Design a protein around this motif. Structure first.
Motif, short mmCIF file in Angstrom:
data_model
loop_
_atom_site.label_atom_id
_atom_site.label_comp_id
_atom_site.label_asym_id
_atom_site.label_seq_id
_atom_site.Cartn_x
_atom_site.Cartn_y
_atom_site.Cartn_z
N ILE A 36 0.81 -1.19 0.00
CA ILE A 36 0.00 0.00 0.00
C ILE A 36 0.87 1.28 0.00
N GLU A 37 0.33 2.29 -0.66
CA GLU A 37 0.78 3.67 -0.60
C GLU A 37 -0.44 4.51 -0.22
N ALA A 38 -0.24 5.49 0.67
CA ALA A 38 -1.40 6.35 0.97
C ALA A 38 -1.00 7.78 1.26
N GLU A 39 -1.94 8.72 1.19
CA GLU A 39 -1.70 10.12 1.51
C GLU A 39 -3.00 10.56 2.27
N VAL A 40 -2.83 11.62 3.04
CA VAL A 40 -4.04 12.14 3.75
C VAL A 40 -4.30 13.45 3.04
N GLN A 86 0.77 7.05 8.07
CA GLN A 86 2.04 6.55 7.50
C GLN A 86 2.74 5.54 8.38
N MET A 87 2.50 5.56 9.71
CA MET A 87 3.04 4.47 10.57
C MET A 87 2.31 3.19 10.24
N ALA A 88 1.00 3.27 9.98
CA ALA A 88 0.22 2.10 9.57
C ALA A 88 0.59 1.51 8.27
N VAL A 89 0.96 2.34 7.26
CA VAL A 89 1.46 1.85 5.99
C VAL A 89 2.76 1.10 6.21
N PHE A 90 3.64 1.70 7.01
CA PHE A 90 4.94 1.12 7.28
C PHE A 90 4.80 -0.27 7.93
#
Length: 151
Positions: free
Chosen positions: A29-33, A122-126
């Motif tokens: 996954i990649e994400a942005e808020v 971003q901690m969750a993506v990591f």
């Protein structure tokens, strides 16, 4: 799954919007808020993603998300085509729901270790991408893309 296929959706949390991209074959996954859902934000994220990974097709569960001139321009420039829902491959849809479910769970688990929601996302993506399931999603995506380089 074809290595060039990604899924992109927005989810809502704490009055903010989280754009979540999942590489179908690996679960990476990649994400942005983002401030709110806009064609400009979707387009900017697509152009970023295509400069980072070999994006051939993108599927979404809200087709209207990809209507705007600005998103069509980003897909045009980057050479991306839309993957039309129509029988969204059963194994594939199951990967997507499962990765989205896992990400929302992890956000909740780390939420109070960060002041801002974007930091927790971003901690969750990591955590997600580094979790071995065996290899991690992060390991799987580089293997899949690297192997695909060599005809």
């Amino acid at each position: 799954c074809s290595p060039g296929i990604w899924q992109l959706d927005c989810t809502h949390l704490e009055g903010k919007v989280i754009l979540v991209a999942v590489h179908v074959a690996s679960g990476y996954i990649e994400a942005e808020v983002i401030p709110a859902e806009t064609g400009q934000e979707t387009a900017y994220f697509l152009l970023k993603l295509a400069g980072r990974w070999p994006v051939k097709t993108v599927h979404t569960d809200n087709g209207s998300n990809f209507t705007s001139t600005t998103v069509k321009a980003a897909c045009w420039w980057a050479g991306i085509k839309q993957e039309f829902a129509i029988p969204y491959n059963p194994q594939s849809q199951a990967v997507i729901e499962s990765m989205n479910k896992e990400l929302k769970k992890i956000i909740g688990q780390v939420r109070d270790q960060a002041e801002h929601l974007k930091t927790a996302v971003q901690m969750a993506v990591f955590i997600h991408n580094k979790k071995r399931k065996g290899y991690s999603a992060g390991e799987r995506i580089v293997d899949i893309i690297a192997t695909d380089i060599q005809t």
